[PDB]
């Protein structure tokens, strides 16, 4: 469960992200593919080289959906319902890979927010990311 301080930390960190959302979603994906090569098996139809526009474009879509979850932080299962259905019944990503992207997302945030990534906020963001992960894998079985 996210506390009031957790919600305030996530909305403040993500407010700072702002208009870089998309760019940071793409860097997070690149970090993931290079650190954990088994995650490339869900993307055989994509150019995964450095600089790829398909990665960029997927970047933004992942980014936009986080923004929408942050804006609906008290009502997530409803805002991400369409998303939950697409991963469970179509893409079918093993739930294990959601922790790997969450880690990489955190690393990306750390590298670009030297001031806002305190111990407290790191904790809140990890909790926020695991909650999105749970919601996204809710309908799998």
């Amino acid at each position: 469960m996210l506390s009031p301080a957790d919600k305030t930390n996530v909305k403040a960190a993500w407010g700072k992200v702002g208009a870089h959302a998309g760019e940071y979603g793409a860097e997070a994906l690149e970090r993931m593919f290079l650190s954990f090569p088994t995650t490339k098996t869900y993307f055989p139809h994509f150019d995964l080289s450095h600089g790829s526009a398909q990665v960029k474009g997927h970047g933004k879509k992942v980014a936009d959906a986080l923004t929408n979850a942050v804006a609906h932080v008290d009502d997530m299962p409803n805002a991400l319902s369409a998303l939950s259905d697409l991963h469970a019944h179509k893409l079918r990503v093993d739930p294990v890979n959601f922790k790997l992207l969450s880690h990489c997302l955190l690393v990306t945030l750390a590298a670009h927010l030297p001031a806002e990534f305190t111990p407290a906020v790191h904790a809140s963001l990890d909790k926020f990311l695991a909650s999105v992960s749970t919601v996204l894998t809710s309908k799998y079985r």
Partner: protein, 146 residues
């Protein structure tokens, strides 16, 4: 790798009583019912809409048979799993695009099936030796991923 002489003999004696086609059918079917996201590779296999259609699917039973025959022969090369499964490892990654996490999931369904099949002869120590082997094979198949 690295079982004791006791561990190898236990794995081999049990394996001598197994019907490889029947168990292969049961294990792969339960993989598809219990963890339904593993069905993602298999839309061309037909009806998978309920547990009974899955377990009854003939395409599912032949995949099971192919997969368990390969496992079965790997049991003879306990000393060199990595060399034995090198080419299959390369194939699953470059061509089939199979997440290696699915090998872990089949290994645990396999161990549940052996217990259901053999009841009390699937003692804790026999289970322990089989846990090491299914992780060893999962590790050998993921080895050439890149």
């Amino acid at each position: 790798m690295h079982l004791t002489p006791e561990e190898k003999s236990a794995v081999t004696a049990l394996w001598g009583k197994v019907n490889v086609d029947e168990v292969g059918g049961e294990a792969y079917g339960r993989l598809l019912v219990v963890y339904p996201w593993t069905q993602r590779f298999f839309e061309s296999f037909g009806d998978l809409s309920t547990p009974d259609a899955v377990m009854g699917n003939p395409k599912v039973k032949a995949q099971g048979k192919k997969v368990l025959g390969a496992f079965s022969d790997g049991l003879a090369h306990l000393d060199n799993l990595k060399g034995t499964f090198a080419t299959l490892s390369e194939l699953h990654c470059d061509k089939l695009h199979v997440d290696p996490e699915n090998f872990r999931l089949l290994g645990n369904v396999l161990v549940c099936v052996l217990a259901h099949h053999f009841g009390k002869e699937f003692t804790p120590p026999v289970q322990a030796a089989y846990q090491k082997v299914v992780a060893g094979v999962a590790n050998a198949l993921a080895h050439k991923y890149h």
